[PDB]
Design a protein around this ligand. Structure first.
Ligand SMILES: O=P(O)(O)O[C@@H]1[C@@H](OP(=O)(O)O)[C@H](OP(=O)(O)O)[C@@H](O)[C@H](O)[C@H]1OP(=O)(O)O
Ligand SMILES: Nc1ncnc2c1ncn2[C@@H]1O[C@H](COP(=O)(O)OP(=O)(O)O)[C@@H](O)[C@H]1O
Ligand SMILES: [Mg+2]
Length: 216
């Protein structure tokens, strides 16, 4: 009947859809996540199409979402919180890594505040599954940089406060495919300006990833 989806982070009930390519995410406390998907669709439809999993529909309290891991033979996933946290400061100052595929092997702890060096080391840990072909892993980094650059550029024109939103980074072990998308609109709010904190998270990630793609 019910297959639990292998979540990297967060607390919401998420299960595989009864059909291929879909996950079902329960809206726990309010339907705010649905209201915000609908609002972005009406006001910023190009943003939704480029950066966000497709919302196929709703069943009671369940969102039917595009499974971002579906087209991958061996997906590696990292959840980075880029929007404001509820109370805490970010573990990496401008963002918080929330989890990644195989993080347990590296003694990753989502409660641990990280130096710049430890932050970089966890991102390198996440990239270890991608293997020793430095050319192929560099290309994954560059394609993430391309899309995050455009996202940061685009965010200047969006009047939302992206509280609690995460970037879901995905690459295949063979490094033949990768993407990054924005998820988790449960705490997002309308405002009258752009979200500078969320833009700062994205530019900081671009800086770090650019250093990784350039290191010899
Ligand atoms: O916004 P965060 O700091 O990243 O963490 C909140 C946690 O907030 P905080 O109060 O520790 O700042 C929330 O704690 P709560 O508001 O229940 O005391 C928790 O419910 C969310 O699942 C939790 O977020 P989650 O890990 O993305 O599920
Ligand atoms: N569309 C998606 N495709 C694949 N995995 C997803 C998708 N949306 C969420 N996830 C997974 O679920 C986890 C929690 O997602 P999120 O939307 O942040 O829910 P929560 O409200 O529980 O924090 C992410 O870390 C990721 O592993
Ligand atoms: Mg989340």
């Amino acid at each position: 009947s019910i297959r639990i989806f292998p979540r990297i982070a967060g607390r919401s009930y998420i299960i595989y859809g009864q059909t291929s390519g879909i996950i079902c995410k329960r809206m726990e406390k309010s339907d705010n996540e649905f209201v915000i998907y609908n609002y972005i669709s009406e006001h910023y439809d190009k943003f939704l199409k480029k950066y966000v999993p497709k919302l196929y529909g709703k069943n009671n309290d369940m969102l039917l979402l595009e499974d971002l891991t579906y087209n991958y033979n061996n997906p590696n996933v990292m959840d980075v919180k880029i929007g404001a946290r509820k109370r805490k400061s970010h573990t990496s100052g401008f963002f918080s890594i929330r989890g990644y595929t195989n993080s347990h092997d590296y003694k990753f702890d989502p409660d641990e505040y990280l130096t710049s060096e430890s932050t970089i080391n966890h991102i390198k840990n996440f990239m270890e599954a991608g293997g020793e072909n430095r050319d192929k892993t560099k290309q994954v980094l560059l394609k993430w940089i391309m899309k995050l650059s455009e996202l940061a550029n685009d965010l200047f024109e969006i009047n939302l406060k992206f509280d609690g939103v995460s970037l879901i980074f995905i690459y295949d072990d063979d490094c033949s495919k990768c993407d990054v998308n924005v998820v988790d609109f449960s705490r997002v709010k309308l405002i009258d300006t752009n979200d500078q904190m969320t833009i700062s998270a994205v530019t900081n990630l671009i800086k770090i990833l650019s250093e990784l793609a350039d290191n010899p």
